[PDB]
Design a protein around this ligand. Structure first.
Ligand code: ZN
Lengths: 148, 187, 1012, 184
DNA sequence: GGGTTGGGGTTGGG
C-alpha cells in the first residue's frame, strides 16, 4: 500500500530478473514485491559512467556490498545544464581530488523502462549504512506481516 | 527519555481521536514541498494585538495597546512532513519558519526572516524565495508534531502543527530502529 | 481606416499581440518540427483536432523541438504518468493550467478537486498527440506553450500553459477621507438637541480626559514636535469649552424652525394612531404631503452650520483666510449629492500654508526647503480639516437631522427635522400594520431558524402622498456563529433560479428579462406585421400593484414542489471568461497585451447530472454570443453541490418566518415574499407566469384559428399587449380581470392605457379608468403605432437631468475616467435598440440625434467640474498639452476620441461585414457630423467655452461635413466603375443618400431627424 | 470535496427507492396463488428487479474493486458502501482516465435485486451504468459502513453509531419481514 | 498561533 520502499542493489536485481522471467502479471508498469511500488531508497557509492553519443541521458552506477545497478540521469531540454544536486556532487568530486563517496539516493523504477534517479545527497557519516540496513530489514518485516 | 512514533501511528490515533483531543509525538522525518500559493505572512502587534486595524499607506494602529505601532510581520508556511511510512500536511509557525530560513541562509537574522520575505515579495523578487524554499527540500530533521481534532465552520477536521524542529543525528534513530526490529523478531 | 468586424479568428487576434512571438496551429507546428509528414495519413477527427487546436509561445522554439534522429518515438508510459512528470518538473511555479485542482508532494502529485478540463487533457486525441510527440518532448511542450482547443463555434478552452489571468495585473502620502456617508439615515432622537452622548463633547463632563478621548489625533505622526501636540491639545480644550455655550434650541428656532401648525400635525397623528377604525385615505395622504413639505433649505442649513462653526472653533486654528475659505466651501459640501463626496485637496489647494501662525519648525526649512516645509505643513492642515469636519459637522447633522432622498427625485438630497421624521415613522408603522406587517415575539419563531438566519432592517423613502418601504439584509449576526447575510446564504438558490430563468422565458408563459429578448420579440412581431401587410394596430397597457406582497406562499410552495423544471441535484462550477471588447484591431505602439483586446469576467454556473443536450459536463460553461468573435474560457477548482430540499427549506423559511426590525421593534411579513432578495424577481415572474398561462389559453391557438397577429410580454409586474384584433384585446382584458379576481390580486390605480375606446359597461369594467393615447409608453420606451419604431424616452430640462448624475473626479486618472464615463453615457441605452431590423435609416438617425442631445446635457456638469482645476500646475498634463490652453486641449482630445469610438461602434452595430467600405465611411462621417453639430450647438452659448474652444469645435464640425461630402461625391464614381454588385441593403442605402441629397448639404434631413 | 458528497444525501434516495421497490412488489404479487408462491420459492435465483428512477443519481469515489466476484466499493465522507455491478461492460462503458481506483464517478442508474437464500431473503444492489468524471487521489477514512453483499447481517452492522444507518437498517428489516410474510 | 472575498463605483429599467 506504500509506493516508496527501501531496498538495495541485490533486491533490485532479483526483482528485475523475476519480472522479466515471469511477465504474466497485471498490465501495469508497477512492480510486485509484497505489493506495488514505484519509489525506492538506497545508500551506495555513485560514479559517473561515460556513455557514447547519448547527450540527453546520463548513465550512472551504484555499486554496493550486494551488487551494482545502472541508473539514468535526465537534464533540462530548453538549456543544457545539470541538476543542482548533481552539480554539487561534481564540484565536491573535483574539490576532494576525484574521490567517490556514498550517497543517499531516491530513485524511481518502472518495468519495461530504465531506472530513473531523481535526487541524492552525499553522506559523510558511516552510521547511515547501519541505519539504512536496519530500516530495510524493518520495512521488509512490516510489509511481510502486513501482507498476511 | 523520549519515545518516537511513526506517521502511520499518528494518523491512526488522530483518526480514532474524538473532537477536541490533542496529543504530541516525536518523529524522524524530512520536510518537503513548502506551499506558497496562499499569503505567506500576517501582521501582529508587539503587545499581542488580536485585531489589527488596516489602513492605507502602510499605516497601522493596534487595539490591544492603543499606540502608533510599527507593523510586525509573522511568517506563515505550509509544507508536508514524511517518514519512510507516510506523509502528512503540517503547519509551520513564525519561530520554526525563521529557524529554517536562518539555517538555510545564515545571512538573514532570525526575526529578520519575515521582513526579508515581505521585502522580496513586495519588491517583486520571487525567484530568490522560490529557490530558497526549494533548497529546503528533503531536509531531514526531528519533528514534534501535535494534532488537533477541531471543528471549523460546523465541519469536523484534523489539523497538524509542528512544535519543535531539531537537527538530526543518526545514532539514536538507528538505535531505536534496532530495538524495534529486535522486539519484532522476538515477537 | 480600421473597422470593427463581426467575425474574427483567434489566431488572427493572437498574432496582433507583441508579447507572443510564435503563434500557429498544432498541425503546422508539427509539420515544421517534422514530427509528421503530409504523405502520412491520420483519422479525420484527429486531423480536425490538430487543425483547430491553437498553440502559442513567447519565443520561437521550433529548433528546440526539431526531430532528432538519435532515437525513435515509442510510448510505454501512461498519459497520467507523463502529465505527472510534467507537473513535477514544473516544481514551485504556481500559475499554470495543469496545476489547477492538484498539489505536488515531493515526486508525488495529488488530485483533490474537480477540474472539468481534465477530460480534454486525458482524451484519446491527447493520447494520440503524446504517441506522436514522445514523453521527453511532451513534458516540455505542456510547459513552453499555451494550448487552446476549440470546443464550440467560436469558443476555446485553455488546457495547458501559464494561466491567461496573469496578464491582467517608494510610496507617496495619501490624505484621509471625509466620512460624508455617515450623515444619511439616522433615526435616533434625544431629549436635548446637540450631539450623541458617546461623543467626546459630552464625555468630558482638564486636558487628561481630552487627551484620552482624542489620542487618535494627538499622537499623529505628522506633528513635528511635542510643542505642536500641546498647542493642538490646548486648541481642542478651547473648542470643547466653547461648545458647551451654544444655545442649540435658539439656533434651531432662528435658522431651521418647525412649521407653525406642527402642534396640529402632531394632534392629527395622535388621533389617527389612537383611532380604532381604518383612517381616511385622502386625509392620510394630505397629512403625508403636509409632513413632507416641511423640508429645510440648503441655504438655511448652511447658515446654521456656519453659525455653529464660527462661535465654537478659534479663528487662529486655521488662519484668517483659510477659515473663510473653509466656511465658503461648507455650502458646496452641504449641497453635495448622495453618491458624491468632497476631497481634502479641494480645501488644501485653495488655502495658504503660511497663513497659520502657530506652526513651528524644528529645523529652519522655511527658507532653505520651502517646498518641503509646505508639504510638511500640508500634512498637518489636512489632518486638522478632517478632524474638524468628521468630529463636528458630521455628528451634528447625524444627530439633529434625518437626511435622505425622495422617490422620483433621483439622487437629489433632502433634509428633515427629527420630530417630523418621528411622526412620519409612527404614521408609516400604522399604515403597514393594518396591511402586511405584524408585531412579533421571539417565542413563536423556532430557535433553529432563529440562530440559523439573520434578520433584516427596514427603511422608508418619502413619496408624493405616501411612502415606499425598503427592507435590507446586509447585517450578519456576530453571535450564534453567523458570518454571512441572507443574500450570501441564498446565492446558490439564486444560481439555480437563474438557470430556471432560461426555460422560463418561452415555455410556460410570456416573461421577458432583458432588452435583447425584448428586441428579438419585437423584430419577430415586426416581420410578421410586414408579412401581413401593415394593418392597423391597437395596444393595451396595465400593471400589477404590489406584486411581491400579493404572492400566495402555499401556492408558490406547491408550484415549486410540483415543478419538474427543477431537478433534484445540481453541481456548481466556477470558471473565468475572456471576451473581446469593442476595440478595433490595430494594423501593423509596441506594448500590446491581452487587456487591450479582452475583458476578464468571473462566472458561476449550476448544472444537472442528466445527459443533457448542452453537455455542460464536457465544457464547463454556457455562454450566448451575438457575434462570431472568439472567446476563451478557463475552469476553476471550487465546486459546490445544492439539493432541491435545501431550496425548499430556504423558501419555506423566507415565506413563513421572515423577521425584520425597525426602531428596535421586530416585525414579520404576513403575505408574499420580501422584495430585495436576489431570488424575488425570478420567483415573482414564475408565480405570475403560472396564472397567466392558466388564463391565456386562447392566445395559444388564436394565431392559426383566424390568423391574427398579436404580441404579449410581461416584465415583472408590467404588462404590454399589441394585437390586430380589438376583440382579442378585450378578451385579454376580461381574462386578466377574471384571473385577478380568482387569485386575489389587483392592478394599479384601476388605470389602463389603450389605443381605442370601448363601452366598459358590457364587460363590468366600470371601475376601471381607461386612458386613451395615440402613442404607447412602456417601461420608459416610446413606440409608434404607425411605423412600429421604438426609441427611448428622455428628460427635457437640465434640472431633471442633473438629479440623476453623480460626479466623481480624481486627478490621478482624469483621461481614463472621463473617456469611460462619456463612453458609458453614450452606449447606455442606444446599443440595445439600434437594431437595423427594427428601424429604418431615418429612424436610426432620429434615435441617435435625441440620444446625443440627452447625453450632452447629461455630461455638461463633468466639464463644469473639470474647469475648477487648472492642469497647468500638473506636470503630467502640462508636458502633453502645453501650459496656455491645457484644459481646452484635454477636453478637445477627449471629445474627439470618444466621438470617433462611438461612431465606429455605431457603424459596426448597424452594418454587416459584407457592406461596402465606402458606405461604412459615409455613414460614419454622417454620424460624426450629427454628434459634433449637436455638441457645438449646445456649447456655443456657454461663457467658459465662449472663446478658444469653440473655434476648434467648429473646425472639427466643418472637417466632418467636408469629409462626408467628399465621400458621397467619390462614391458615385466608385460605383460607376461596374466593379461592384450591390445587394438590397446597399441599394436601400444608396436610395436613402440620394433622396436626402447629401451631396450638397444637410438641410433636407434636419427637419426629418429633429422632429419631436 | 467531502462536503459536496455529503450534500448528496444518498440515504434519502436509497430509502425512497427501497420503498418504491417494496410497494411495486406488493402490488404486482397480490395474486397469492399458493402453488405459484411455492414454486417461485427456490434457492439462489432472482425474483424481482426494480430499476431506480432518474432522480436518484449520486456520485462517489471508487476505493477498491474486485473482478472475480464483481464487487465494487464506493465511499463518500463518513460512509463507504460495498455494492456489485452487472458485468465488465459497465467498467468498459465508463471511460476511466487511468484506473477505476481513486476516480470520481457518477451512477447513471442502478437497480435493487432481491434473492432468496438459506430460507431468507437478501437484497442486492447492482450498478448498471457508470461514468467517470475526474480522478480523486484522496483517501477518505470512513469510520462507518454498510454492506449490501451480506444482507441483514451486513447492513445492521455498526448501526448504533449512525442514526441514518439505524433508520435504513430498520427499513430493511421491515421490508424483509413484509416480503417473508407475503411469500410464506 | 490562521482561516470565502472585500471591495470600487454608482447608469437605466424593474
Ligand atoms: Zn498593540
Amino acid at each position: 500500500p506504500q509506493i516508496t520502499v527501501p531496498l538495495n542493489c541485490f533486491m533490485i536485481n532479483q526483482i528485475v530478473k523475476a519480472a522479466k522471467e515471469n511477465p504474466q502479471a497485471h498490465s501495469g508498469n508497477h512492480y510486485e514485491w509484497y505489493g506495488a511500488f514505484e519509489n525506492a531508497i538506497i545508500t551506495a557509492k555513485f560514479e559517473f559512467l561515460q556513455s557514447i553519443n547519448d547527450s540527453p541521458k546520463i548513465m550512472g552506477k551504484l555499486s554496493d556490498s550486494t551488487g551494482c545497478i545502472e541508473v539514468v540521469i535526465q537534464k533540462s531540454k530548453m538549456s543544457d545544464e545539470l541538476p543542482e544536486f548533481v552539480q554539487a556532487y561534481e564540484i565536491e568530486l573535483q574539490n576532494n581530488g576525484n574521490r567517490h563517496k556514498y550517497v543517499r539516493a531516491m530513485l524511481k523504477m518502472r518495468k519495461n523502462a530504465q531506472i530513473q534517479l531523481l535526487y541524492f545527497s552525499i553522506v559523510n557519516d558511516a552510521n547511515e549504512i547501519s541505519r539504512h540496513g536496519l530500516d530495510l530489514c524493518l520495512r521488509y518485516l512490516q510489509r511481510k506481516h502486513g501482507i498476511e | 527519555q523520549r519515545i518516537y512514533s511513526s506517521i502511520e501511528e499518528i494518523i491512526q490515533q488522530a483518526q480514532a481521536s474524538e473532537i477536541g483531543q490533542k496529543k504530541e509525538f516525536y518523529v524522524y522525518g524530512n520536510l518537503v514541498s513548502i506551499q506558497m500559493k496562499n499569503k505567506l505572512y500576517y501582521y501582529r502587534c508587539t503587545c499581542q494585538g488580536k485585531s489589527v486595524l488596516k489602513y492605507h499607506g502602510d499605516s497601522f494602529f493596534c487595539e490591544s495597546c492603543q499606540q502608533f505601532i510599527n507593523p510586525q510581520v509573522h511568517l506563515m508556511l505550509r509544507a508536508f512532513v514524511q517518514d519512510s511510512t507516510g506523509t502528512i500536511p503540517v503547519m509551520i509557525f513564525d519561530q520554526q519558519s525563521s529557524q529554517l530560513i536562518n539555517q538555510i541562509d545564515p545571512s538573514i537574522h532570525v526575526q529578520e526572516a519575515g521582513q526579508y520575505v515581505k521585502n522580496c515579495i513586495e519588491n517583486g523578487q520571487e525567484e530568490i524565495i522560490r529557490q530558497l524554499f526549494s533548497k529546503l527540500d528533503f531536509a531531514r530533521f526531528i519533528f514534534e508534531i501535535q494534532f488537533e481534532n477541531k471543528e471549523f465552520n460546523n465541519e469536523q477536521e484534523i489539523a497538524y502543527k509542528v512544535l519543535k524542529i531539531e537537527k538530526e543525528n543518526i545514532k539514536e534513530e538507528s538505535k531505536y530502529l534496532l530495538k524495534k526490529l529486535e522486539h519484532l523478531i522476538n515477537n | 481606416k480600421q473597422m470593427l468586424t463581426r467575425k474574427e479568428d483567434l489566431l488572427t487576434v493572437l498574432k496582433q499581440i507583441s508579447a507572443l512571438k510564435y503563434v500557429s496551429n498544432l498541425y503546422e507546428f508539427l509539420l515544421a518540427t517534422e514530427k509528421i509528414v503530409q504523405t502520412s495519413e491520420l483519422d479525420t477527427q484527429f486531423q480536425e483536432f490538430l487543425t483547430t487546436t491553437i498553440i502559442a509561445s513567447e519565443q520561437n522554439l521550433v529548433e528546440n523541438y526539431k526531430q532528432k534522429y538519435n532515437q525513435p518515438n515509442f510510448s510505454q508510459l501512461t498519459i497520467k504518468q507523463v502529465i505527472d512528470d510534467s507537473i513535477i518538473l514544473l516544481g514551485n511555479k504556481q500559475n499554470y493550467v495543469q496545476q489547477i485542482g492538484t498539489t505536488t508532494i515531493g515526486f508525488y502529485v495529488e488530485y483533490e478537486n474537480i477540474n472539468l478540463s481534465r477530460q480534454t487533457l486525458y482524451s484519446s486525441n491527447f493520447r494520440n498527440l503524446l504517441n506522436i510527440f514522445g514523453e521527453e518532448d511532451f513534458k516540455y511542450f505542456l510547459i513552453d506553450f499555451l494550448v487552446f482547443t476549440k470546443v464550440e463555434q467560436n469558443g476555446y478552452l485553455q488546457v495547458a500553459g501559464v494561466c491567461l489571468n496573469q496578464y491582467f495585473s517608494e510610496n507617496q502620502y495619501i490624505y484621509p477621507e471625509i466620512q460624508r456617508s455617515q450623515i444619511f439615515y439616522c433615526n435616533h432622537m434625544g431629549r436635548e438637541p446637540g450631539v450623541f452622548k458617546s461623543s467626546f463633547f459630552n464625555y468630558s463632563e482638564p486636558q487628561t480626559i481630552i487627551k484620552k478621548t482624542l489620542l487618535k489625533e494627538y499622537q499623529s505622526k505628522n506633528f513635528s514636535c511635542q510643542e505642536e501636540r500641546d498647542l493642538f491639545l490646548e486648541f481642542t480644550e478651547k473648542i470643547v469649552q466653547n461648545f458647551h455655550n451654544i444655545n442649540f434650541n435658539y439656533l434651531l428656532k432662528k435658522f431651521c424652525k418647525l412649521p407653525e401648525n406642527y402642534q396640529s400635525l402632531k394632534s392629527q397623528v395622535k388621533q389617527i394612531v389612537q383611532s380604532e377604525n381604518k383612517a381616511n385615505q385622502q386625509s392620510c395622504e394630505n397629512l403625508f404631503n403636509s409632513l413632507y413639505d416641511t423640508e429645510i433649505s440648503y441655504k438655511q442649513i448652511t447658515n446654521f452650520l456656519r453659525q455653529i462653526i464660527q462661535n465654537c472653533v478659534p479663528n487662529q486654528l486655521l488662519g484668517k483666510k483659510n477659515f473663510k475659505v473653509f466656511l465658503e466651501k461648507l455650502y458646496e459640501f452641504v449641497q453635495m449629492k448622495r453618491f458624491e463626496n468632497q476631497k481634502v485637496l479641494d480645501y488644501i489647494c485653495f488655502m495658504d500654508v503660511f497663513d497659520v501662525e502657530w506652526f513651528v519648525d524644528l529645523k529652519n526649512q522655511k527658507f532653505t526647503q520651502k517646498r518641503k516645509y509646505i508639504s510638511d505643513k500640508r500634512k498637518i492642515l489636512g489632518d486638522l480639516i478632517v478632524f474638524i469636519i468628521n468630529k463636528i459637522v458630521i455628528p451634528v447633522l447625524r444627530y439633529n437631522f434625518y437626511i435622505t432622498e425622495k422617490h422620483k427625485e433621483g439622487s437629489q438630497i433632502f433634509y428633515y427635522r427629527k420630530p417630523i421624521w418621528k411622526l412620519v415613522s409612527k404614521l408609516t408603522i400604522v399604515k403597514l400594520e393594518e396591511e402586511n406587517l405584524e408585531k412579533v415575539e421571539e417565542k413563536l419563531i423556532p430557535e433553529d431558524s432563529f440562530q440559523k438566519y439573520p434578520q433584516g432592517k427596514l427603511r422608508i423613502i418619502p413619496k408624493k402622498g405616501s411612502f415606499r418601504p425598503i427592507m435590507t439584509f446586509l447585517r450578519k449576526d456576530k453571535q450564534k456563529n453567523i458570518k454571512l447575510n441572507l443574500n450570501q446564504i441564498l446565492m446558490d438558490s439564486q444560481l439555480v433560479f437563474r438557470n430556471l430563468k432560461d426555460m422560463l422565458g418561452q415555455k410556460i408563459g410570456y416573461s421577458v428579462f432583458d432588452n435583447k429578448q425584448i428586441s428579438e420579440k419585437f423584430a419577430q412581431f415586426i416581420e410578421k406585421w410586414k408579412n401581413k401587410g401593415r394593418p392597423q394596430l391597437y395596444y393595451v397597457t396595465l400593471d400589477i400593484k404590489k406584486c411581491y406582497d400579493s404572492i400566495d406562499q402555499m401556492k408558490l410552495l406547491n408550484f415549486f414542489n410540483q415543478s419538474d423544471l427543477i431537478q433534484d441535484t445540481y453541481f456548481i462550477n466556477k470558471y473565468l471568461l475572456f471576451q473581446r471588447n469593442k476595440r478595433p484591431l490595430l494594423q501593423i505602439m509596441d506594448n500590446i497585451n491581452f487587456p487591450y483586446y479582452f475583458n476578464l469576467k468571473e462566472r458561476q454556473i449550476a448544472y444537472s447530472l442528466y445527459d443533457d443536450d448542452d453537455q455542460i459536463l464536457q465544457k464547463g460553461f454556457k455562454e450566448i454570443q451575438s457575434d462570431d468573435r472568439p472567446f476563451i474560457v478557463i475552469n476553476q477548482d471550487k465546486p459546490r453541490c445544492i439539493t432541491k430540499d435545501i431550496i425548499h427549506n430556504h423558501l419555506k423559511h423566507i415565506s413563513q418566518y421572515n423577521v425584520i426590525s425597525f426602531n428596535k421593534v421586530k416585525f414579520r411579513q404576513k403575505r408574499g415574499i420580501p422584495q430585495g432578495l436576489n431570488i424575488s424577481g425570478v420567483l415573482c415572474s414564475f408565480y405570475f407566469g403560472k396564472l397567466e398561462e392558466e388564463y391565456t389559453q386562447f392566445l395559444k391557438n388564436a394565431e392559426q384559428v383566424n390568423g391574427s397577429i398579436n404580441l404579449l410580454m410581461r416584465l415583472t409586474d408590467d404588462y404590454l399587449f399589441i394585437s390586430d384584433s380589438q376583440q382579442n384585446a378585450l378578451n385579454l382584458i376580461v381574462q386578466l380581470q377574471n384571473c385577478a379576481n380568482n387569485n386575489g390580486f389587483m392592478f394599479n390605480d384601476q388605470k389602463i392605457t389603450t389605443n381605442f375606446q370601448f363601452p366598459q359597461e358590457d364587460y363590468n369594467l366600470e371601475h376601471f379608468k381607461i386612458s386613451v393615447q395615440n402613442e404607447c409608453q412602456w417601461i420608459g420606451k416610446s413606440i409608434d403605432m404607425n411605423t412600429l419604431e421604438i426609441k427611448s424616452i428622455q428628460k427635457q430640462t437640465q434640472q431633471e437631468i442633473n438629479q440623476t448624475i453623480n460626479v466623481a473626479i480624481s486627478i490621478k486618472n482624469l483621461k481614463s475616467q472621463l473617456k469611460n464615463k462619456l463612453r458609458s453615457l453614450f452606449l447606455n441605452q442606444l446599443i440595445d435598440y439600434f437594431n437595423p431590423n427594427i428601424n429604418s435609416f431615418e429612424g436610426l438617425c432620429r434615435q441617435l440625434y435625441h440620444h446625443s442631445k440627452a447625453t450632452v446635457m447629461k455630461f455638461y456638469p463633468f466639464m463644469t467640474k473639470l474647469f475648477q482645476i487648472d492642469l497647468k500646475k500638473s506636470k503630467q498634463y502640462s508636458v502633453q498639452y502645453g501650459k496656455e490652453n491645457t484644459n481646452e486641449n484635454f477636453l478637445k482630445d477627449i471629445l474627439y476620441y470618444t466621438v470617433e469610438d462611438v461612431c465606429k461602434i455605431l457603424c459596426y452595430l448597424q452594418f454587416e461585414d459584407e457592406i461596402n467600405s465606402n458606405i461604412k465611411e459615409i455613414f460614419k462621417n454622417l454620424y460624426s457630423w450629427i454628434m459634433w453639430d449637436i455638441i457645438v450647438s449646445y456649447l456655443k452659448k456657454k461663457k467658459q467655452f465662449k472663446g478658444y474652444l469653440n473655434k476648434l469645435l467648429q473646425k472639427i464640425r466643418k472637417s466632418r461635413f467636408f469629409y462626408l461630402k467628399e465621400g458621397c461625391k467619390s462614391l458615385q464614381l466608385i460605383l460607376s466603375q461596374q466593379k461592384y454588385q450591390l445587394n438590397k441593403k446597399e441599394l436601400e442605402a444608396i436610395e436613402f443618400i440620394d433622396l436626402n441629397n447629401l451631396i450638397q448639404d444637410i438641410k433636407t434631413l434636419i427637419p426629418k431627424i429633429s422632429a419631436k | 470535496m467531502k462536503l459536496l458528497l455529503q450534500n448528496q444525501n444518498i440515504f434519502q434516495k436509497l430509502k425512497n427507492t427501497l420503498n418504491g421497490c417494496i410497494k411495486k412488489f406488493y402490488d404486482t404479487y397480490q395474486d397469492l396463488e399458493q402453488m405459484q408462491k411455492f414454486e417461485m420459492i427456490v434457492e439462489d435465483k432472482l425474483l424481482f428487479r426494480y430499476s431506480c428512477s432518474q432522480s436518484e443519481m449520486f456520485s462517489a469515489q471508487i476505493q477498491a474493486h474486485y473482478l472475480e466476484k464483481r464487487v465494487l466499493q464506493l465511499t463518500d465522507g463518513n460512509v463507504k458502501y460495498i455494492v456489485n455491478f452487472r458485468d465488465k461492460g459497465v467498467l468498459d462503458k465508463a471511460n476511466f482516465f487511468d484506473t477505476p481506483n481513486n476516480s470520481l464517478v457518477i451512477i447513471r442508474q442502478w437497480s435493487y435485486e432481491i434473492y432468496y437464500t438459506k430460507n431468507t431473503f437478501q437484497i442486492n444492489l447492482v450498478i448498471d451504468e457508470m461514468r467517470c468524471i475526474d480522478i480523486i487521489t484522496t483517501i477518505f477514512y470512513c469510520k462507518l459502513e454498510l454492506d449490501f453483499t451480506q444482507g441483514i447481517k451486513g447492513i445492521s452492522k455498526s448501526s448504533s453509531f449512525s442514526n441514518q444507518i439505524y433508520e435504513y437498517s430498520a427499513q430493511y428489516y421491515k421490508a424483509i419481514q413484509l416480503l417473508k410474510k407475503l411469500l410464506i
